[PDB]
C-alpha cells in the first residue's frame with residue numbers, strides 16, 4: 001500500500017510534436033510535470049526565437065486549464081545558425097537551451113567547427129548544450145555510435161569549450177555512464193525509462209517490437225546494468241528526461257518503423273519501479289525533481305505529488321484524430337501509479 | 340547483357356508453410372529449383388512419416404503443371420519422437436533429413452527437444468542409418484544476448500555433439516557469424532553449412548539504421564558487418580561445404596508489420612539473383628554454380644541436376660507485394676531494381 005511522496009518532477013527531455021499530435025500528447029506531461037525541456041526537432045525545425053515563441057504558444061493553448069505546466073523551449077542548432085539568434089531568444093527567456101543533433105538526413109550539425117562560434121556564445125552566456133551523442137558514419141555499426149561519439153566528439157568538444165555546460169541526452173551505454181560519472185560539474189546526463197527497463201533482447205527476442213525501437217538504440221544488458229547502477233548510486237549529475245517521442249501506430253508498425261517511445265503516460269511509475277528494484281527509493285526524488293533544476297540553475301518545484309504502489313494497468317492505445325497512439329507498456333501492468 | 344547459365348539449382352533450406360499460403364508460395368520455388376529441403380515447422384510440427392507423406396502430397400498438388408519439382412521432407416526432432424519412426428521414414432525415402440530446433444526447457448515434448456542428451460537415442464539412430472542432421476544453431480537462454488546465440492551454440496552444443504556422434508553428417512543451417520564460418524571451414528567432410536541471401540547481402544545496420552525494418556528481421560538475427568564479411572569470404576573462397584539454403588520463410592504482411600513482427604524473409608522469388616549479385620561483387624562467379632547446384636547434392640549424396648537455367652544480367656524491378664487470399668506478402672527486396680534475373 002506504499003505511497004511515495006515526492007516534490008513535483010520535471011521532464012528534462014521531451015518531444016511534443018505539433019498540431020493534433022501536440023494537442024493529444026501534452027496533457028500526459030502537463031498533468032504531472034512542472035516543467036519540461038521541449039525538443040526543437042519539428043519540421044521544419046525551430047531555429048528562430050520567433051518560431052520558438054509561436055510553438056511555445058501552441059503548447060500553452062493545449063495545456064489543460066488546471067495544470068501548472070511550463071514548457072522550456074530549445075533551439076535547433078544548425079551549421080549556419082546566427083549566434084545572435086541564440087542570445088536574443090536566450091536573453092528574452094525564449095530559449096533555455098540549444099540541442100545538437102548530429103547530421104543525418106537532416107539539418108543537424110555537419111561539424112563542431114562549422115558551429116564553433118555558436119558554441120562559444122553559449123559558453124559565454126552560460127547556455128547549456130543538449131547533445132544527442134551519436135556519430136553517423138554509414139559504416140559505423142549502430143550499436144557503436146554512442147561510444148564513438150565520446151572520443152571523437154564529446155571530449156574534444158569539452159576540452160575546447162572548458163566552461164561549456166553540457167547535457168549528454170538519453171545515455172544508453174556503460175561507456176557513457178562512466179564518462180559522465182567521471183566528468184566535471186559542467187557535464188550531466190538524462191536517462192529514459194526504456195533504457196533502464198530493457199535491453200536489446202527485449203526488442204528482438206520472440207519478435208521485433210517497434211514500440212521498443214528508439215534512438216539511441218537499446219543496447220546489450222551490460223549497458224543497461226551500468227545505467228541502472230548509475231542512477232541507483234545517487235550520482236547527482238543524472239536526471240529524468242523521458243525522451244517521450246510519439247508516433248502514430250502505423251508509422252511505428254510499418255515496413256520502416258519510426259524511432260521513439262511514447263512513454264509520457266508511464267515514465268514516472270516506470271522510473272519508480274526501477275529505483276525500488278535497485279533498492280534506491282532514497283535517490284528517487286532527486287533524480288526526478290532536484291538534479292535537473294540544479295544543473296539548470298532553476299529552482300525546484302514547490303509542489304508535491306504522490307505515487308501509490310498499486311498495480312495499475314496501461315491502455316492498449318490512445319486515440320488520435322487519425323490512427324492511434326500506442327503507449328509505452330501498452331496493455332501491460334505497472335506497479336506504481338500516480339494518485 | 341551477360342548470361343549466366345548453371346545447372347538447375349536446389350534450395351537446401353526452405354519453409355513452404357501450408358494451406359493457402361503454401362499454394363501461393365510453392366510456384367516461386369518450383370519454377371526454379373529442382374529439389375528443396377522442406378522444413379517441418381508446421382503447426383503442429385511434422386513428426387511422423389504419415390504427416391510427412393500427406394504434407395509432401397499437398398506440396399505436389401500446388402506445383403504448377405510444367406514445373407519438375409521434388410520436395411525433400413524432413414522430420415522435426417522432439418523428445419518424444421520414436422527413433423523407429425524416424426528410421427522408417429528415412430528407410431522409405433520419406434524423410435531426407437531431420438531438423439533440430441533450439442531446445443527450450445519450457446517446450447512441450449511433442450513440439451521440441453528439452454536438451455540434446457534427451458534425444459540421444461534419436462541421434463544415434465541417425466548416425467547409424469547415415470541420416471543427415473540439420474541444425475538451427477542457437478542457444479535460447481534468456482540470459483543470452485540475441486547476437487551471441489549462434490557463437491554460444493558452437494561451444495556449448497555443436498562441438499560436443501559432434502564429439503559424441505563422430506559419424507553423424509551435420510548441416511549448420513543458415514550461418515550468420517564469422518564464428519560459424521571459421522568453424523565450418525575448418526571442419527571435417529561430415530560438416531557443411533547453408534547461407535541465406537539476406538545474410539550475405541546485409542548486416543544489422545540495414546535492419547536498424549534509419550528505421551526498424553521488419554522485412555529484414557529473421558532468425559538467426561543479422562549480425563555486425565564483420566560477420567557479413569566473413570560469410571561473403573566463405574562463399575567466395577570456393578569452399579565446397581557451403582551451399583544454397585534460402586531460408587525463405589514467408590509471413591503475411593500484417594504479421595510482419597505489427598507490434599511484434601514475425602521473423603522471416605520471403606526470399607524465394609529473388610534469392611537466386613541476389614546470390615549471383617553477391618558472387619559477382621566478390622569476383623567469385625566461378626564458384627556460383629557449385630554453391631547453387633553441386634555442393635549440396637554432393638553433401639547429401641544426391642545426383643547433381645541434369646537441366647540448366649539461365650540468369651541474365653538485365654535490370655529488373657521486384658514486385659511491391661504478392662497477393663494472398665486475405666493479405667499480401669512482401670518479397671525480399673520488394674520494389675527494388677534487381678541486377679540479375681532468371682530468363
Ligand SMILES: NC(=O)N[C@@H](CC(=O)O)C(=O)O
Pocket residue numbers: 137138139140544545546547548549
Ligand atoms: N543506411 C542505412 O539505412 N542503414 C545502414 C547501412 C549500412 O550500414 O550498411 C547505415 O549504416 O546507416
Ligand SMILES: NC(=O)N[C@@H](CC(=O)O)C(=O)O
Pocket residue numbers: 015041132213214215216243245246259260261
Ligand atoms: N529518440 C528517438 O527514438 N526518437 C526521437 C528523436 C531523438 O530523441 O533523438 C524522435 O523525435 O522521434
Ligand SMILES: O=C(O)c1cc(=O)[nH]c(=O)[nH]1
Pocket residue numbers: 354380475556557558559588589602603604
Ligand atoms: O519458419 C519461420 O518463420 C523461420 C524460422 C526461423 O528459424 N527463421 C526465421 O527467420 N523464420
Ligand SMILES: [Zn+2]
Pocket residue numbers: 132169170215216
Ligand atoms: Zn536524441
Ligand SMILES: [Zn+2]
Pocket residue numbers: 013014015039243245
Ligand atoms: Zn529526443
Ligand SMILES: [Zn+2]
Pocket residue numbers: 475512513558559
Ligand atoms: Zn532456422
Ligand SMILES: [Zn+2]
Pocket residue numbers: 352353354378586588
Ligand atoms: Zn528455417
